[PDB]
RNA sequence: GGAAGUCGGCAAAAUAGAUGCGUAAGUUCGCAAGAAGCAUUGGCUCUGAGGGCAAUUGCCAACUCAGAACUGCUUACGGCGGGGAAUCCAACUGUAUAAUU
RNA sequence: AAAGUUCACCGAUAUUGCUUCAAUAGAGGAAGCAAAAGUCGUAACAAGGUAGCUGUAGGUGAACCUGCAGCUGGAUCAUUU
RNA sequence: AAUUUUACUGUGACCAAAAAGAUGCGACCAAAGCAGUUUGCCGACUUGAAUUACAAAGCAUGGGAUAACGAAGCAUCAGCCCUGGGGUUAUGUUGGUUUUAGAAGUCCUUGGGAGAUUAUGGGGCCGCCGCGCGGCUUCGAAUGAAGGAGGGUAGUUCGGGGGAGAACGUACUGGUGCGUCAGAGGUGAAAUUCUUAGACCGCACCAAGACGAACUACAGCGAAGGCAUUCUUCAAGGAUACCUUCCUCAAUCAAGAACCAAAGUGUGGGGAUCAAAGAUGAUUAGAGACCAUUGUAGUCCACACUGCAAACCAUGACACCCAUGAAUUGGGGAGUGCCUCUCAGCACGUUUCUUACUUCUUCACGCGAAAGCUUGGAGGUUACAGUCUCAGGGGGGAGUACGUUCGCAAGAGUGAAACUUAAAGAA
RNA sequence: GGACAAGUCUGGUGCCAGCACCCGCGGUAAUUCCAGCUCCAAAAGCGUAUAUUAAUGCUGUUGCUGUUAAAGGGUUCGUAGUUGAACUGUGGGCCACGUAGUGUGGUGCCGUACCAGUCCCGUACCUCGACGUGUUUUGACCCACGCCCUCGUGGCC
RNA sequence: AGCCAGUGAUGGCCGUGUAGUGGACUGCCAUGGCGUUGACGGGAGCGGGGGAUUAGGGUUCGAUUCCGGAGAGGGAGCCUG
RNA sequence: GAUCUGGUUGAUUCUGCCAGUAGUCAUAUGCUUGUUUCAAGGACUUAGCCAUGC
């Protein structure tokens, strides 16, 4: 069955952007999707996106603009210390000077580099560049 | 897809967006609860409830108006089934596969298909025992 | 694709110990039924007896005399087919004499066209078996 | 001394009750099995367990089993399997030449 | 207050018996792998001259043959509109 | 009274040396070692820093991702405040007979302010089948229903799905009754075979056992193995329709269980056809084979075993995304032909939709060593992470030996090594 | 000889003797054997044997393969184990001006187009008075930002 | 793939021995304790601080100078402290 | 330093193993060795047997 709505959601976008589509339609959606979009969003890397309202879980609606290569969940959520955000970075990004390694921390989910600023650490939810 | 098998069926209800009561029910929520309880009384089950409102009274979606839903109703006035509807409709198919099985010994179809049922039965019992609906030990047979 | 868990590591273990008996490499290592079988008790070299003096042909494509000779050894009196190189040199082992053997490379694989002969004459008389070939040296 | 006797261990010797432990190959899974083998055992003075009936008390009956201290042997009625490894034949219990099988 | 007597306890060592592990001889009966190509054939590779192969049962100097069910990895992607 | 715990993350606490990273100093450099430097005196500056640590442990910060408890809701019901009543301490000290009055408990009653669910309905009579009035006494607050699972109702829906009976159809073989007269059968060619004691052929019947042609397909049903005449029966299964019910009940799996073509085994039946073994005739250098005539076990049924197949799509199960055009099976929604009752019916034409088997030569992208795969992918993968599980590790020895479990047996499952070889293999 | 830096040099042997870790060389002209001469590597060092680490993504958590190369269980059920859908909520004003995109209204409305008019075709045009740009300027959004908020409503004040 | 109980196995009660607690031990009582999260048995082996190899993850070695344990040919008893 | 090369074919693209290559306070054996500094040295097998002195 579906175990894992993050994982969803990010293979539906990568995929849409793969073939080159203009919008994509994702379910079932969550407040963690919501808020890896603001992410992305925030980094001018999506575009607008507007949820769908059902008396259940909702829809999702995202404008693409031809900017992102790729995004993944990183399964399981492992775990990262503020002095183990290179590791990461190393592995999986084609490049330090661009990319984003978005983090769940107690403070919230955002990317390393502010969690970095704010001298954190937490368990990794995925990437885009 | 079903769990004991190879179907793929997609055939259900899909509820509407719209809750409230559509203004040309009359039918007051007391006289809902009423006829509820008027045909609990005949023995007919929570389901076959909702269909005779439905089909016959105007009320679809017994939820929207009273507020509650129809098991809850039949527990608070005392005449909720001994054991749940689902597990019960379930032991009554299985008797009569045995039933049928004693006169006809080389129905290995019906043999295999008596396996599922009563897996089935093992599988729900287990569940309503974890959340109280049956007095722990309760077996099936 | 395979288990992934983050309360796996149990599976993930047993995997890895069951799967590792299929090498060859790593079960020789592990196993001691290779010390038993090889003559030379996990040894590099070896003490012994000439026997007698033998010649061995060569596989198909060649066609030699491979001038072996026959080693019963002392610590544990096994009988084994060395060979004796370089040319000449058959003429300073004689019969009864106590030589030094080594393997011939390939950890107890035959080499080259030389059926089934895996070791190789070092000393002899405890003097070398080069230098008498180079003259550095005479035989006691 | 221990089968050297004799066609041939024939005849004799030999084992032995009970209790605790322990018991192989083979097998038709029932057996083989008391396989094989080891230990204890007397006398005297005590202790514990195992019940019934009347109102916690009183009275009363049956010998079985377990345990301890002391003390002794000249190994001491009768009665009571010797054991093991194999080959041939017949599956087995049974019958059968009264008076040589 | 030594020598000595009796009993309990710890217990070396020996004998006997079980159990377990590692090495070892053996008349005969077989299997594998090499060497030389010695004898007899031609089962497979082409429709390999009876298409081949899998499972099973029987037979026969040898490769093999035969019956039953299956497969194409076939020698056919195909012919009452 | 009250009175949450864990993992993860930040910063402190707590940690022999040697070794390891390193902070300082030309031991002539270096591997080292903690020491050393003054343009000279009865001295001065002095150093030897600071780190780390598989997991567990210990104070305290957040609360995002997590997991441990609890509940299964009618198993629950309980305003708050303010009067006013009814019913140990001191007594200078010690020991007792004493007691203040309070505080609790209950039962009464007086101010007020709240309420997350209207006090309404019933009992209720009379006079005007209904009809309001008068006095009246009596006794609804819960997240939502997953394009996740389960159950329900309906078309008495759909189909070579399964089990039981009763019949039907020609055909092969063997009989019976008539007719006829010299050959028939078989092969590349023949010969074993049958035949004036009437074979083969023709017509009509009888018995027995098996099997259901054509229609029959890139069609249907079943978990797989499998399933094909009609009628009567028994219990099931999937899809569709639904403003029915329920509320995480789920996915996948060591151990364990049930089923499983053909051949084979045991005990009773049955025995037409075909046919392992065997017997004859040919062909051949030979022929134990292929071809011909036969023929036992088997082939069929019931009840017990066995548990193996190229048991194949050589492709494990669950979930998501993903380009087109023609077809086909079942359910549902919205001009033509037949039409006195399984009939407000049945087919067809046009447009949508859910499910199933797939096809493109005028089918993507993409992937792959290639052949090829492509909406049950072999794609979305060095831009490598959705979840679970079963196998592999150069070719042989070998699915062999030994041990053990199961089996009446045949066998099945588990399963090495010594030795030997540079290739074997794929497109 | 190649991997691997370095001779198509000169004598001897003739599938012999021997080399060769692997591929291979030697049967009368051997780039490979035994020697002479040159040269190459590294050097007070340099060969050989055995074990082990890296080469090895040939043990794969990072990170393998399973249609045909070795490898998906004959099919279902099923326990321990592993993995499991969404939801309770991340404020409001003013500051002040910097900045900031939307749309919002109005403002001028040139120049062209367009709209309604005049001459008037044809069966084209010419004259005359709003509609649309694009100059400015309102409303919210966000970014720079100090304070206050009984920081939902109440109910106080 | 089961292990442990006569003759201590898991716990209880008064006791005894020890420096002291304790099933360490005597008598009595109960029926427990451990195990597919691998008990019981077998093989190799003194623990650690650490060495080798090093993109990273890892693989491997550690008798040996510091710390801990154990022994004095084999195995048992004990005096003095 | 995050590196690879030779062998299956008449040629080609693969799977795959054999062989090459660098270390080792890692042991042993062979050849050869002027100076100096720092150094391990009967564990491996037999916790085998021991003259004499301390
Ligand atoms: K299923
Ligand atoms: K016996
Ligand atoms: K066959
Ligand atoms: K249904
Ligand atoms: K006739
Ligand atoms: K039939
Ligand atoms: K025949
Ligand atoms: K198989
Ligand atoms: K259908
Ligand atoms: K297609
Ligand atoms: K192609
Ligand atoms: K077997
Ligand atoms: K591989
Ligand atoms: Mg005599
Ligand atoms: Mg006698
Ligand atoms: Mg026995
Ligand atoms: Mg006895
Ligand atoms: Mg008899
Ligand atoms: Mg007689
Ligand atoms: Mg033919
Ligand atoms: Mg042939
Ligand atoms: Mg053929
Ligand atoms: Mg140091
Ligand atoms: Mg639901
Ligand atoms: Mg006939
Ligand atoms: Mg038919
Ligand atoms: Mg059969
Ligand atoms: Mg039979
Ligand atoms: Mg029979
Ligand atoms: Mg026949
Ligand atoms: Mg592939
Ligand atoms: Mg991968
Ligand atoms: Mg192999
Ligand atoms: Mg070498
Ligand atoms: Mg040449
Ligand atoms: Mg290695
Ligand atoms: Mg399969
Ligand atoms: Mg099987
Ligand atoms: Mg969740
Ligand atoms: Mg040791
Ligand atoms: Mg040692
Ligand atoms: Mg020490
Ligand atoms: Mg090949
Ligand atoms: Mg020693
Ligand atoms: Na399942
Ligand atoms: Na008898
Ligand atoms: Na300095
Ligand atoms: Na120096
Ligand atoms: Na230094
Ligand atoms: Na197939
Ligand atoms: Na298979
Ligand atoms: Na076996
Ligand atoms: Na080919
Ligand atoms: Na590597
Ligand atoms: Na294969
Ligand atoms: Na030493
Ligand atoms: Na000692
Ligand atoms: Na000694």
Redesign the pocket.
């Known amino acids: 069955?579906?175990?894992?709505?993050l994982?969803?959601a990010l293979?539906?976008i990568?995929?849409?952007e793969?073939?080159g589509k203009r919008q994509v339609?994702i379910?079932?959606?969550?407040?963690?999707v919501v808020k890896f979009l603001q992410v992305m969003q925030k980094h001018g890397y999506i575009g607008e996106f507007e949820i769908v309202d059902?008396?259940?879980?909702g829809?999702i609606v995202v404008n693409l603009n031809g900017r992102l290569?790729?995004c993944?969940?990183?399964?399981?959520?492992?775990?990262?210390?503020?002095?183990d955000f290179e590791?990461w970075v190393?592995?999986?990004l084609?490049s330090r000077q661009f990319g984003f390694v978005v983090?769940?921390?107690?403070?919230?989910?955002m990317d390393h580099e502010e969690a970095r600023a704010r001298?954190?650490?937490?368990?990794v939810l995925g990437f885009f560049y | 897809?079903?769990?004991?098998?190879?179907?793929?069926?997609?055939?259900?209800?899909?509820?509407?967006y719209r809750?409230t009561p559509?203004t040309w029910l009359k039918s007051?929520?007391?006289d809902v609860?009423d006829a509820v309880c008027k045909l609990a009384k005949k023995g007919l089950?929570?389901?076959?409830?909702?269909?005779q409102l439905?089909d016959s009274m105007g009320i679809?979606?017994?939820?929207?108006?009273?507020?509650?839903?129809?098991?809850?109703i039949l527990?608070?006035?005392?005449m909720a089934p001994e054991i749940?509807?689902?597990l019960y409709?379930?032991i009554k198919?299985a008797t009569?596969?045995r039933?049928?099985l004693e006169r006809?010994?080389?129905?290995?179809?019906?043999?295999?298909?008596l396996?599922?049922?009563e897996?089935?039965i093992?599988?729900?019992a287990?569940?309503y025992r974890?959340?109280?609906?049956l007095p722990p030990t309760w077996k099936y047979e | 694709?395979?288990?992934?868990?983050?309360?796996?590591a149990?599976?993930?273990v047993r995997?890895?110990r069951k799967?590792?008996w299929?090498?060859?490499?790593?079960?020789?290592?592990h196993?001691?039924?290779?010390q038993?079988?090889?003559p030379?008790g996990?040894?590099?070299?070896a003490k012994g007896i000439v026997l007698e003096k033998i010649?061995v042909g060569?596989?198909?494509?060649?066609?030699?005399?491979?001038?072996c000779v026959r080693v019963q050894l002392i610590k544990n009196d096994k009988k084994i087919i060395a060979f004796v190189?370089?040319?000449?040199?058959?003429h300073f082992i004689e019969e009864n004499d106590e030589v030094?053997v080594?393997?011939?490379?390939?950890?107890?694989?035959?080499?080259?066209?030389?059926?089934?002969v895996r070791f190789?004459i070092?000393?002899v008389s405890?003097?070398?078996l080069?230098?008498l070939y180079?003259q550095?040296?005479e035989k006691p």
């Open positions: 069955t579906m175990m894992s709505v994982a969803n293979r539906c990568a995929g849409a793969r073939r339609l379910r079932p959606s969550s407040k963690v059902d008396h259940r879980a829809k290569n790729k993944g969940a990183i399964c399981p959520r492992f775990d990262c210390t503020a002095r590791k190393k592995n999986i084609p983090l769940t921390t107690s403070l919230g989910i001298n954190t650490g937490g368990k | 897809v079903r769990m004991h098998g190879n179907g793929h069926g997609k055939a259900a209800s899909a509820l509407p809750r559509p007051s929520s007391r609860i089950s929570p389901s076959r409830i909702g269909m439905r679809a979606q017994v939820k929207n108006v009273t507020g509650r839903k129809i098991l809850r527990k608070h006035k005392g749940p509807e689902d409709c379930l198919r009569q596969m039933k049928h006809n010994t080389k129905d290995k179809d019906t043999k295999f298909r396996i599922l049922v897996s089935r093992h599988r729900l287990r569940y974890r959340v109280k609906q | 694709t395979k288990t992934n868990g983050q309360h796996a149990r599976k993930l995997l890895r799967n590792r299929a090498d060859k490499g790593w079960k020789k290592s196993t001691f039924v290779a038993k079988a090889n030379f996990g040894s590099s070299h010649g060569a596989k198909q494509p060649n066609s030699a005399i491979r001038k190189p370089n040319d000449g040199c058959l030094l080594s393997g011939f490379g390939r950890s107890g694989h035959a080499v080259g066209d030389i059926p089934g190789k070092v000393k405890s003097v070398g080069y230098a180079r550095k040296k």
